[PDB]
Amino acid sequence: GSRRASVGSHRFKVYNYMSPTFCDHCGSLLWGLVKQGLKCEDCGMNVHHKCREKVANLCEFIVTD
């Protein structure tokens, strides 16, 4: 037996955060009131623009739907 997972590479898009949000890579605040970072459209990971190139491309999540 195994979980069903969606497995691919991240699909980051510039995101406008409405609440103070931290970088899931480095832990620092996503500064600004708009376009503060990128959110993966698939798994929800949030990263600074500068951290996009520091994260592994692997993007997985468990599918419950």
Place this chain on the structure above:
Amino acid sequence: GSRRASVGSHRFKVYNYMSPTFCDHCGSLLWGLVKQGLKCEDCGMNVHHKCREKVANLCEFIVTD
């Protein structure tokens, strides 16, 4: 880059084939006119009852939605 795949184990359910259909494992006809075998609800693999025991559990398909 990479494709995105849905990955898990097969989820077979007895299926009523409306046209002559073959076992995706062994190649022999799924005999009869109803409940001839099982179809994986995730990837569509068709198997005889007896072949359910023989196939690898791995179930993957490319997501195009």
